[PDB]
């Protein structure tokens, strides 16, 4: 057996990492009507209703969850997306004019004083000759005074010009699959204790990741995948105190918002088939919103937290948690959306106590916001239409993101807060267990046959 | 028939297993190499053209090595005992296809070199062959 | 007849060592894969281990990979599963079934069954 | 791993009339599916193969329909020799799984 040739094969299981291009595929049932939502599923390419997957048993394979490509491509993706479903809609130019409020003191309680204005002013009309004399309710977050019924205007006047969401489109997440080309696979990690770094000894390739919902909040991931066996802390370097820490709770928690205000709308005709639609009078009362969890059922979930913290800290530290530091609004307050309006809740009731090494409600107050600065961008604004009547949403509370503070030396104690800011962290909790490698269908071997002449 | 009686089958199914036990099932790879203005509206054609230009490159090395149309194909140059010293036993029976792709990495270009010139010399032999009757 | 026919049963302390047998005869040995099934008193039916056609591959349930394994002698048409390391959850009546066809992946053929108890 | 639910848990049904059962699966399976019957203290056999073929050797009466995530096995008449426990198996995505198995009674 020393005469050995070489032998062509064509077809082999081998691969290699690569970076492409993937594509969508949304569910059938999206089809029915439902047009009307930002995650435009129409260009998506209907879902296989039975998908395949298969085990690659012997298998181990190296993940990196912090340098995958897939969360960049992800990110853009949803990004051009909310851009492109803004194209067709009222651009709010002459917007940007004096007006002249005062505060809404009308059966209010102590909490929202000078929270709602009653503004006036002049506006444009589908006629380019006359105008008219118009009023509307802004929220104390939009509006800066510029120098009684002292005179105001629009936040974002000096920076850019807004642009009303049209009001048939629907905010709601819509669960999306992202499927690899011809000749490229997708690995999945099916370890239920892989930590997102290292070797993964079970494996197995499919054609199209799992439904995932672009929720988009802070401080606070909602709507999520839960772990199957138990809380799990994953971070870059835990050591520095740079690098953000993820969470995944073992179980769901729910948390209840509402908005307990009967709001009105009005339709104003600002230019030939032009609408803006203003915010009228409220129908009885007016009070604060604000968001509930179960104090007991949060108490049992912030406790196995920090069991699984001190197996990177040591059996006898004390850990303790405190509200964010600073920062703007976006950045030092838990921000969803909730069925159209846009809340930002002060989570601080959440995050205050203390861990030794040993029926009732929490209510977050929130405010609300018409002017969204998304992606952290400058220069690119939105306006959301008011929402008639009231409102009321529920949602499971899945991790979290949180921070630590640079202590000098080991002085026993630890302090973690929370905190969001980039979109990135919130897709990366859901991409964690994929990876993208490309096929080399071609081997070469030694063996004793030999061509005939 | 029960074919060769396997557990199952699928895609990069033998990716775990021996050279010897991963070369019956080539096709089950092979026949899934080509298929299996929007935001969505290029994403999805530059890859299928990037699909159908791989593809193209392959298929070109097997024909200019004289392989066209084939699954295993045997050849006319000699292995050198530079590129692995390994028995024929510890090769096909305690190694893998992703295993042994890292060993043998460095030479691959040689030998896909010898190969063309093996082919060269073979369709000019017979040729002149040929030409003689 | 076509049939399967396991023994071997029989007492093992928790940590002991088990193995058992399943002989056929009626048909091509050598021409089908065959799996192994065990039910738990009171749960369904799970998966445990498989093997091919001519014994090259071998495929191991996560509970019970590092300590069973299976084999086969296609000469005396017998199959084998060793037990290594035995606990209390390893409680079942075992079924050595049979694979027919090549993508027929299904069972046609089941066995009587054996059980195996641990105590101390 | 796809999970096998087989509900009711128990069926209660007279000789003679009709009898259904159901197996739901938590993801689409196609139509890789088998039914599987096993009387106390012997070898299981099968009965239905592809969710829709019946198994050579197995009475006429036995009849199942069904595809995607929705099965249902049905039988024309029950007989004194029905009584035994019936398990769904899908054979889509490795490793195979089997339902919690549904008893009937006589």
């Known amino acids: 057996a020393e005469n050995l040739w070489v032998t062509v094969y064509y077809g082999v299981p081998v691969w290699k990492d690569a970076e492409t291009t993937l594509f969508c595929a949304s569910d059938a049932k999206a089809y029915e009507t439902e047009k009307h939502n930002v995650w435009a599923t129409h260009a998506c390419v209907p879902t296989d209703p039975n998908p395949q997957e298969i085990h690659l048993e012997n298998v181990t394979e190296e993940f990196n969850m912090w340098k995958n490509n897939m969360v960049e491509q992800m990110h853009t993706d949803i990004i051009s997306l909310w851009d492109q479903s803004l194209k067709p809609c009222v651009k709010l130019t002459p917007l940007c004019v004096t007006l002249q409020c005062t505060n809404v003191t009308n059966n209010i309680t102590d909490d929202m004083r000078g929270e709602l204005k009653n503004c006036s002013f002049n506006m444009t009309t589908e006629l380019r000759d006359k105008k008219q004399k118009v009023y509307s309710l802004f929220y104390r977050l939009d509006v800066v005074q510029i120098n009684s019924n002292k005179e105001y205007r629009l936040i974002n006047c000096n920076t850019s010009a807004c642009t009303q969401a049209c009001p048939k489109v629907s905010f709601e997440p819509i669960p999306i699959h992202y499927c690899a080309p011809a000749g490229f696979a997708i690995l999945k990690c099916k370890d239920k204790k892989f930590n997102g770094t290292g070797p993964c000894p079970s494996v197995s390739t499919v054609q199209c990741t799992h439904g995932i919902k672009p929720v988009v909040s802070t401080q606070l991931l909602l709507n999520g995948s839960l772990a199957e066996e138990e809380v799990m802390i994953r971070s870059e370097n835990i050591t520095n105190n740079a690098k953000n820490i993820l969470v995944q709770f073992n179980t769901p928690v729910q948390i209840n918002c509402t908005r307990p205000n009967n709001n009105t709308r009005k339709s104003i005709r600002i230019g030939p088939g032009q609408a803006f639609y203003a915010t009228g009078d409220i129908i009885g009362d007016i009070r604060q919103a604000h968001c509930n969890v179960s104090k007991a059922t949060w108490n049992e979930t912030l406790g196995k937290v920090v069991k699984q913290l001190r197996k990177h800290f040591g059996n006898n530290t004390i850990i303790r948690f405190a509200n964010s530091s600073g920062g703007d609004l976006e950045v030092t307050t838990h921000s969803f959306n909730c069925g159209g309006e846009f809340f930002y809740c002060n989570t601080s009731g959440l995050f205050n106590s203390t861990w030794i090494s040993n029926n009732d409600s929490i209510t977050l107050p929130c405010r609300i916001k018409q002017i969204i600065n998304m992606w952290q961008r400058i220069g690119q604004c939105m306006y959301a239409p008011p929402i008639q009547g009231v409102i009321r949403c529920v949602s499971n509370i899945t991790g979290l993101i949180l921070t630590r503070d640079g202590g000098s030396t080991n002085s026993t104690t630890e302090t973690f807060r929370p905190g969001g800011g980039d979109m990135r962290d919130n897709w990366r909790s859901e991409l964690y267990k994929y990876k993208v490698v490309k096929i080399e269908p071609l081997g070469v071997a030694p063996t004793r046959c030999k061509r005939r002449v | 028939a029960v074919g060769i009686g396997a557990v199952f089958l699928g895609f990069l199914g033998a990716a775990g297993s021996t050279m010897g036990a991963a070369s019956m099932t080539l096709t089950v790879q092979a026949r899934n190499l080509l298929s299996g203005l929007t935001v969505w509206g290029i994403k999805q054609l530059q890859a299928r053209v990037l699909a159908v230009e791989r593809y193209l490159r392959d298929q070109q090395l097997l024909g200019i090595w004289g392989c066209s149309g084939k699954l295993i194909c045997c050849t006319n140059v000699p292995w050198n005992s530079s590129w692995s010293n390994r028995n024929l036993s510890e090769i096909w029976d305690n190694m893998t296809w992703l295993q042994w792709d890292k060993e043998i990495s460095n030479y691959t270009q040689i030998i896909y070199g010898l190969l063309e010139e093996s082919q060269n010399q073979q369709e000019k032999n017979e040729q002149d062959l040929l030409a003689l009757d | 007849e076509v049939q399967l026919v396991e023994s071997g049963e029989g007492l093992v302390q928790p940590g002991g060592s088990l193995r058992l047998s399943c002989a056929a005869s009626?048909?091509?040995?050598?021409?089908?894969?065959m799996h192994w099934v065990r039910q738990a008193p009171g749960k369904g039916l799970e998966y445990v281990s498989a093997?091919?056609?001519?014994?090259?591959?071998?495929y191991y349930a996560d509970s019970v990979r590092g300590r069973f394994i299976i084999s086969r002698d296609n000469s005396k048409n017998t199959l084998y599963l060793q037990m290594g390391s035995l606990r209390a959850e390893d409680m079942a009546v075992y079924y050595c079934?049979?694979?027919?066809?090549?993508?027929?992946?299904?069972?046609?053929?089941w066995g009587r069954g054996t059980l195996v108890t641990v105590s101390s | 791993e796809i999970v096998m639910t087989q509900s009711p848990a128990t069926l209660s049904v007279s000789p003679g009339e009709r009898a259904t059962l159901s197996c739901r699966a938590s993801?689409?399976?196609?139509?890789?599916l088998a039914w599987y019957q096993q009387k106390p203290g012997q070898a299981p056999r099968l009965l239905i193969h592809?969710?829709?073929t019946r198994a050579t050797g197995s009475p006429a009466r036995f009849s199942g329909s069904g595809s995607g995530t929705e099965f249902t096995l049905t039988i024309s008449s029950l007989q004194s020799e029905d009584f035994a426990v019936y398990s769904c198996?899908?054979?889509?995505?490795?490793?195979?799984?089997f339902g919690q198995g549904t008893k009937v009674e006589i």
């Open positions: 592809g969710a829709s």
């Open positions: 093997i091919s056609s001519e014994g090259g591959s071998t």
């Open positions: 198996q899908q054979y889509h995505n490795w490793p195979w799984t």
């Open positions: 009626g048909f091509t040995f050598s021409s089908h894969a």
């Open positions: 079934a049979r694979v027919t066809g090549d993508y027929n992946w299904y069972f046609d053929l």
């Open positions: 993801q689409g399976v196609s139509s890789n």
